Amino acid sequence: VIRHFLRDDDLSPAEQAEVLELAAELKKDPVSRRPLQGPRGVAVIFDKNSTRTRFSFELGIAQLGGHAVVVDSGSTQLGRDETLQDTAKVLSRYVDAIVWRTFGQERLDAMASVATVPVINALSDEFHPCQVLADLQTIAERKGALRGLRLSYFGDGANNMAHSLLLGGVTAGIHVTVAAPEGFLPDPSVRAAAERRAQDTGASVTVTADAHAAAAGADVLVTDTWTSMGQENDGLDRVKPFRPFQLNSRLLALADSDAIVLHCLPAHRGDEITDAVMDGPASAVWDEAENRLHAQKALLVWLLERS
Amino acid sequence: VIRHFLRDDDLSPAEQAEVLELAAELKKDPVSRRPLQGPRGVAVIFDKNSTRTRFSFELGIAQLGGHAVVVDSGSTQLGRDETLQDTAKVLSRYVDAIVWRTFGQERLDAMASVATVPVINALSDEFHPCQVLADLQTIAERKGALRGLRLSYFGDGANNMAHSLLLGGVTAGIHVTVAAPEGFLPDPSVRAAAERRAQDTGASVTVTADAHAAAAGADVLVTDTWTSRVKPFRPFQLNSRLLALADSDAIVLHCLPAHRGDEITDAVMDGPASAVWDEAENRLHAQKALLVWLLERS
Amino acid sequence: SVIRHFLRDDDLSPAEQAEVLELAAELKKDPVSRRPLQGPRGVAVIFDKNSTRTRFSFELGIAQLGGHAVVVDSGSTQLGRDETLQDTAKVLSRYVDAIVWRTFGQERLDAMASVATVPVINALSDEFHPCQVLADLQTIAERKGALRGLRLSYFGDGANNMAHSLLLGGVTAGIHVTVAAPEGFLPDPSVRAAAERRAQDTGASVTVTADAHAAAAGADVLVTDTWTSMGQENDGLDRVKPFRPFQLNSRLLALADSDAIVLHCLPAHRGDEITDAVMDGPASAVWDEAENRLHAQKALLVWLLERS
């Protein structure tokens, strides 16, 4: 059985713990594991723009001994000239894993349904699970055991980061709160999956429109841009509902005195997060970005040896 | 004293056999040849979109120890800011071979006239010779000796795949048939070159509008998308009806991407005659063999 | 230690430039003998503008130092739009050991270098092209030996990146540099003054003239470049008539030293700034010059990495 990573709950709590431990080991010894020596190939396909995911996967694959074939948005978007299933079958003959940033989750599901190699979600409309592996590695290295920590996410509660912080966070035993305005709440199916997974780990799920209540006592405060490129023409004012949820100094003062701040980047300073918070002593955004490299190398090692 | 690969007949029958033998060796032992260790560079330039050619060349070059510099069609078109001859001279100072997917064959000829390193056609409007090397490797590993086999291509008989199956097929001793409607027949000078090469190998060339006759007794049945306007080609659809007419143990090939329901049906493409996935894999092995072979002769 | 960047030619002292150029000759002889980036370690190579020579030379050179170039080209969204240049520089510094960047305004390079924790290298900007001039100096040294006291004349637009870098990099090597350009197209005053100060240290000199024949006479090296960059195509000027007298043609080359060599960074517009006869003739060193982008930039990277 081939293991894929299309959503955070694809890993059990025990498996997630294995990946996060390998991530810590690979951060210490970054070229000690060469499962892709040869080089073996890995597909890294971008239907959307990327800086952090592009650099971290391309270099991480190289440091595992492999060669990343990076496909840009200049190539014809996949699924136009042939079925995604046909593409997955041919790519499986060239590479040992397929890393793909795309739109609908169903596109990832289609490729994983027929690929003979692991398929990894490098960002979809619905989830960003490699980002949250790096977030969890960052939280662990700054706070220790993840179980019982309180994490609050602020902004659009139905975007990929909100969904993956729910799923990935409760898998780690984190008490996850999503603070979002009315009409921007997590997908019900994702919320229910996080609630079921939380039963197994002692975690919990909270969804609230009360930003100050979400910030109070939190160990980790997280936010993300409020609007994806596909939502810019959706007809909504996507600024006025979110301003109460801005991660600013006043909000940070409400959290635990030792709280840290995460943001997957790119940040739009002055919108979802302020300069004072992002450049202040609680910010862990640069270590978080670095840990994309280490966490994704661990994920690849782990999937490859189980597939 | 420098060898290029712009069309299938650039290799003699004997040299094609050498490259195909190397392809089988490299498929068994994919990192056993490292002529590009260093790394030395290879340019891989795309004037137009690619999946299979991009992956197969980029990874194949890496597995020869080299480093492919992949130039995308999003980058400024080649020969727009300076002559192709100036580009060829400069690239020859950085890389040991130039792989190029373009349109007009005369562009490939211009590059190859001045480059001091091998130039390889990664797909042109006229030929797709690296695809046919992979096809020949696929046929060989399933049927053994190529000489005397019957291969039929169906559909648009005027495109690069039809031309290269003609030229590369007769170079291997294959009796090649193109089944195509009038107005979409092979270029006469390509057909004439194929008939000429066929005299040396025991091969032959047939061009027919009768898909049933072409399918009857065929050992290899091949098709490709119809446009690069569909009414003339429908009778040449590679479906279960035609396949039922072929020889026992016949192989089905399609260079990809496929438009399922047009030139080929799901039942044929997903059925037990289909070798389209091995065929696509063999782009990697056959192109590595081609590069090894060209580099040691250049 | 401090972090050394290479944004303009004078970022290297004369002694430091000599070290880089010596390393360039050593690496040309033994191209895989230095592996500071083995691992591989990453290097970012970002192109806000098109390139062939800089793209191939940096991507392969980095690989031959053992590293892995992450090449970002113009189809990926332009840097500075999705997030600040400073945020980008901080993030890249966590993934790579150096940042190579072809961009527009020099101030954009200054912004990344202010926050980056790794060397930033100018791979061509509006104001300078210092990696080209390192390759030019390597080529001249190959052909002529000692650079000190040679006479080099550049012809064409006196205010573009190649004129500025030939001034600064040339006098840093002890070369007497002349820029021959029509009035109105003269070097930036602050670059001219900086080159005059640096020339005083090396015994070199700076000359700026509208007299192309006088600039060619006695020269050891004649250099030109295209007259018009993309950003100037719509500046309203006739950018042909003023530059015709400055064309590097056979008549001009005949006025220089009988063993003079000809350089051109490429791409060339044959028939405008240079003629076929000159570019394809025996004085032309343009192909060696292009090849030396590989060697000189490898030397630069080795040198910066060991000091950062």
Nearest chain C alpha carbon to B78: C52
B94–C270: do the CB atoms touch at under 8 Å?
Answer: no
Angstrom distance (rounded) from CA C68 to CA A58? 9
Overall resolution, Å = 1.7
Chain C touched by A270 (CB under 8 Å): no
* A224, A246, A263, A294: the active-site residue: A224
Chain B touched by C75 (CB under 8 Å): yes
Identity of the amino acid at C190: S
Match 């081609």 to its residue by tokens. Answer: B290
> After which residues does chain A show a gap where C to N exceeds 2.5 Å?
none
Answer whether A289's CB lies under 8 Å from C87's CB: no
> After which residues does chain B show a gap where C to N exceeds 2.5 Å?
228
- Number of H helices and E strands in chain A, helices first, is 11, 9
Angstrom distance (rounded) from CA B246 to CA B216? 5
Confirm whether A128 is a catalytic residue: yes
- Rounded to the nearest angstrom, the minimum Cα separation between A74 and chain B is 6
State residue A5 phi and psi, 5-degree precision.
-135, 80
**How many C-beta atoms surround the C-beta of residue C81 within 10 A?**
9
Angstrom distance (rounded) from CA B6 to CA B120? 6
- Rounded to the nearest angstrom, the minimum Cα separation between C84 and chain A is 9
* A7, A33, A128, A191: the active-site residue: A128
Does the bond joining C282 to the residue before it have cis omega, within 30 degrees of 0?
no
Answer whether C239's CB lies under 8 Å from C228's CB: yes
Chain A touched by C81 (CB under 8 Å): no
| Cβ contacts of A43 on chain B, cutoff 8 Å | 55
Angstrom distance (rounded) from CA A43 to CA B194? 38
Chain A touched by C84 (CB under 8 Å): yes
Answer whether B276's CB lies under 8 Å from B258's CB: yes
Chain C touched by A265 (CB under 8 Å): yes
Chain B touched by A75 (CB under 8 Å): yes
State residue A224 phi and psi, 5-degree precision.
-160, 165
Which of A54, A59, A137, A265 is best to mutate for the C interface (most C CBs within 10 A)?
Answer: A59
- Helix (H) or strand (E) segment spanning residue A45: strand A41-46
For the record, the structure tokens of C54 come out as 């800089």
Of C31, C55, C287, the CB nearest to B93: C287
Angstrom distance (rounded) from CA B47 to CA B72? 7
Half-sphere exposure of B275 (CA within 13 A, CB side): 23
Angstrom distance (rounded) from CA C122 to CA C78? 16
- Rounded to the nearest angstrom, the minimum Cα separation between B221 and chain A is 20
For the record, the structure tokens of B205 come out as 């060339």
For the record, the structure tokens of A297 come out as 């190398």
Nearest chain C alpha carbon to A56: C95
Nearest chain A alpha carbon to B72: A74
Confirm whether A40 is a catalytic residue: no
| Positive or negative: CA dihedral C205, C209, C211, C216 | positive
- The residue among A39, A43, A35, A34 whose CA lies nearest residue A92 is A43
For the record, the structure tokens of A236 come out as 């909504």
Neighbour subunits, B (≥3 Cβ pairs < 8 A) = A, C
- Rounded to the nearest angstrom, the minimum Cα separation between C101 and chain A is 15
Rg (CA), chain B: 18
Answer whether B86's CB lies under 8 Å from B115's CB: no
3-state secondary structure C157-218: CCCCHHHHHHHHHHHHCCCEEEEECCCCCCCCHHHHHHHHHHHHHHCCEEEEECCHHHHHCC
| Cβ contacts of A273 on chain C, cutoff 8 Å | none
3-state secondary structure A106-162: HHHHHHHHHCCCCEEECCCCCCCHHHHHHHHHHHHHHHCCCCCCEEEEECCCCCHHH
Angstrom distance (rounded) from CA B251 to CA A150? 60
B69–C56: do the CB atoms touch at under 8 Å?
Answer: yes
Detail the DSSP E strand segments found in A220-304: 220-223, 260-263
| Cβ contacts of C95 on chain A, cutoff 8 Å | 55-56, 59, 290, 293
Q: Which residues of B are tagged catalytic?
A: 101, 128, 131, 224, 255, 283
Angstrom distance (rounded) from CA C168 to CA C176? 11
For the record, the structure tokens of A22 come out as 């390998």
For the record, the structure tokens of B20 come out as 């195909």
Q: In what order do the strands lie in the sheet with A119-121?
A: A67-71, A41-46, A95-101, A119-121
Using the 8-state DSSP alphabet, how is residue B26 labeled?
Answer: H
> After which residues does chain C show a gap where C to N exceeds 2.5 Å?
none
A55–C83: do the CB atoms touch at under 8 Å?
Answer: no
**How many C-beta atoms surround the C-beta of residue A250 within 10 A?**
12
| Positive or negative: CA dihedral B29, B33, B39, B42 | negative
Angstrom distance (rounded) from CA B122 to CA B93? 21
Chain B touched by A93 (CB under 8 Å): yes
| Cβ contacts of C83 on chain A, cutoff 8 Å | 265-268
* Residue B142 DSSP SS3: helix
C63–B89: do the CB atoms touch at under 8 Å?
Answer: no
B69–C50: do the CB atoms touch at under 8 Å?
Answer: no
Nearest chain B alpha carbon to A90: B277
Angstrom distance (rounded) from CA A175 to CA A168? 11
- Over the range B98-109, which residues count as b (16 or more CB within 10 Å of their CB) and which as e? bbbbbeebebbe
Nearest chain C alpha carbon to A63: C40
Angstrom distance (rounded) from CA B292 to CA B64? 8
- The residue among C131, C165, C142 whose CA lies nearest residue C300 is C131
Angstrom distance (rounded) from CA C79 to CA C99? 13
Confirm whether A150 is a catalytic residue: no
Size of interface B-C (CB pairs under 8 A): 62
Angstrom distance (rounded) from CA A44 to CA A69? 6
Burial label, C77 (beta-carbon count in 10 A; 0-12, 13-18, 19+): middle
**How many C-beta atoms surround the C-beta of residue C211 within 10 A?**
11
Angstrom distance (rounded) from CA C8 to CA C6? 6
Chain A touched by C254 (CB under 8 Å): no
For the record, the structure tokens of C190 come out as 């602050």
Cβ neighbours of residue A233 under 8 Å, at least 6 residues apart?
A: none
Chain A touched by C95 (CB under 8 Å): yes
Confirm whether A93 is a catalytic residue: no
Half-sphere exposure of B225 (CA within 13 A, CB side): 9
B71–C59: do the CB atoms touch at under 8 Å?
Answer: no
- Identify any residues that bridge with B101 across adjacent strands, giving them in sequence order: B46
Q: Give the DSSP per-residue string, B50-119.
A: -SHHHHHHHHHHHHTT-EEEEE-TTSPPTTSSS-HHHHHHHHHHHEEEEEEE-S-HHHHHHHHHH-SS-E
* Residue B171 DSSP SS3: helix
For the record, the structure tokens of B42 come out as 């290879």
Experimental method: X-ray
Cβ neighbours of residue C52 under 8 Å, at least 6 residues apart?
A: B71, B81, B87, B90, B91, C267
Nearest chain A alpha carbon to C93: A290
Cβ neighbours of residue C253 under 8 Å, at least 6 residues apart?
A: C216, C222, C260, C262, C278, C281, C283
Angstrom distance (rounded) from CA A138 to CA C155? 56
- Rounded to the nearest angstrom, the minimum Cα separation between C74 and chain A is 10
Of C84, C87, C95, the CB nearest to A56: C95
Chain C touched by A54 (CB under 8 Å): yes
Angstrom distance (rounded) from CA A251 to CA A229? 27
- Over the range B60-95, which residues count as b (16 or more CB within 10 Å of their CB) and which as e? bbbbbbbbbbbbbbebeebbebbebebbbbbbbbbb
- The residue among C93, C97, C100 whose CA lies nearest residue C6 is C100
State residue A178 phi and psi, 5-degree precision.
-105, 120
B277–A89: do the CB atoms touch at under 8 Å?
Answer: yes
3-state secondary structure A20-38: HHHHHHHHHCCCCCCCCCC
Angstrom distance (rounded) from CA C100 to CA B164? 42
Chain B touched by A81 (CB under 8 Å): yes
Is A265 flagged in the annotation as binding?
yes
Q: Give the DSSP per-residue string, B179-234.
A: E--TTSPPPHHHHHHHHHHHHHHT-EEEEES-HHHHHTT-SEEEE--S----GGGG
Angstrom distance (rounded) from CA C178 to CA C181? 10
Q: How many residues does chain C have?
A: 308
Q: Give the DSSP per-residue string, chain C.
A: -PPP-BSSGGGS-HHHHHHHHHHHHHHHHSTTS--TTTTTPEEEEEESS--SHHHHHHHHHHHHTT-EEEEE-TTSPPTTTSS-HHHHHHHHTTT-S-EEEE-S-HHHHHHHHHH-SS-EEES--SS--HHHHHHHHHHHHHHHS--TT-EEEEES-TTSHHHHHHHHHHHHTT-EEEEE--TT-PPPHHHHHHHHHHHHHHT-EEEEES-HHHHHTT-SEEEE--S--GGGTTSSS--STTTGGG-B-HHHHHHS-TT-EEEE-S---BTTTB-HHHHTSTTB-HHHHHHHHHHHHHHHHHHHHHT-
Neighbour subunits, C (≥3 Cβ pairs < 8 A) = A, B
How far lies A270's CA from each of A228, A288, C83, C167, in Å?
A: 17, 20, 12, 43
Which of C78, C95, C101, C115 is best to mutate for the A interface (most A CBs within 10 A)?
Answer: C95
Match 């080529």 to its residue by tokens. Answer: C139
Cβ neighbours of residue C233 under 8 Å, at least 6 residues apart?
A: none
Does the bond joining A281 to the residue before it have cis omega, within 30 degrees of 0?
no
Angstrom distance (rounded) from CA A56 to CA A293? 4
| Cβ contacts of C31 on chain B, cutoff 8 Å | 38
For the record, the structure tokens of B19 come out as 């490259």
B49–A87: do the CB atoms touch at under 8 Å?
Answer: no
* A107, A191, A263, A292: the active-site residue: A292
State residue C291 phi and psi, 5-degree precision.
-60, -40
State residue A125 phi and psi, 5-degree precision.
-55, -35
A286–C94: do the CB atoms touch at under 8 Å?
Answer: yes
